[PDB]
Amino acid sequence: MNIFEMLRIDEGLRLKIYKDTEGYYTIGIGHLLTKSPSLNAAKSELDKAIGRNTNGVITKDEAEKLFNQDVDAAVRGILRNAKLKPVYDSLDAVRRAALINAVFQMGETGVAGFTNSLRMLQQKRWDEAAVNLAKSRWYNQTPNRAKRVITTFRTGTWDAYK
Ligand SMILES: [Cl-]
Ligand SMILES: [Cl-]
């Protein structure tokens, strides 16, 4: 089990443009295309990303390539982030996977705002941070995914995923 298999489980794989849980235009493995309501805009963003006239449909290889770029962007944001870097550095390999997940899903700014939970994570107060991570819009909108991620922060194992 690794970050790639993990996110692949949480995001699934779709070869045609689709709408996410928030109603946004997405494609592949959670690759958000635009917050815009226009399918045209979405189509245009996808063609830009792939480098071709896609017609709103991509192939497996293509989805995987976006996915690779996105995981890499995610890690890089955490390391560049003044609030994130430190938490990340202090954690073990599994728990690091869970922070990358959360970022991939909510953006760095987004995760960087969870001030209190970050602090508890850093202090290694597992049960405490889990509860705190639970009091969020994130947990209320996507309860099952959040449950999995939070369980990973709490335990330090892949149990929620096996
Ligand atoms: Cl892109
Ligand atoms: Cl969910």
UniProtKB/Swiss-Prot annotation:
Enzyme nomenclature, EC number: 3.2.1.17
Binding site for substrate: L32, F104, S117, N132
Result of altering D20C: Nearly no effet on specific enzymatic activity
BP-aspect Gene Ontology terms: cell wall macromolecule catabolic process; defense response to bacterium; peptidoglycan catabolic process; viral release from host cell by cytolysis
Keywords from the named record: Antimicrobial, Bacteriolytic enzyme, Cytolysis, Glycosidase, Host cell lysis by virus, Host cytoplasm, Hydrolase, Viral release from host cell
GO cellular component, as recorded: host cell cytoplasm
Chief subcellular location: host cell
Catalytic activity entry: Hydrolysis of (1->4)-beta-linkages between N-acetylmuramic acid and N-acetyl-D-glucosamine residues in a peptidoglycan and between N-acetyl-D-glucosamine residues in chitodextrins
Effect annotated for changing S117I: 500-fold decrease in enzymatic activity
Active site: E11 (proton donor/acceptor), D20 (proton donor/acceptor)
Phenotype when changing T26E: Complete loss of activity at neutral pH; covalently bound substrate
Induction conditions: Expressed late in the viral replication.
GO molecular function, one term: lysozyme activity
Result of altering D20 to E/Q: Loss of 99% of enzymatic activity
Effect on the protein upon substituting T26H: Facilitates transglycosylation more effectively than hydrolysis; covalently bound substrate
CDD domains from the UniProt entry: T4-like_lys
Cited Pfam families: Phage_lysozyme (PF00959)
Listed InterPro entries: Endolysin_T4_type, Glyco_hydro_24, Lysozyme-like_dom_sf, Lysozyme_dom_sf, Phage_lysozyme-like, T4-type_lysozyme
Entry-linked PANTHER family: T4-TYPE LYSOZYME 1-RELATED
Family, similarity comment: Belongs to the glycosyl hydrolase 24 family.
Function in brief: Endolysin with lysozyme activity that degrades host peptidoglycans and participates with the holin and spanin proteins in the sequential events which lead to the programmed host cell lysis releasing the mature viral particles. Once the holin has permeabilized the host cell membrane, the endolysin can reach the periplasm and break down the peptidoglycan layer.
Protein known as: Endolysin
Organism from which the protein derives: Enterobacteria phage T4 (Bacteriophage T4)
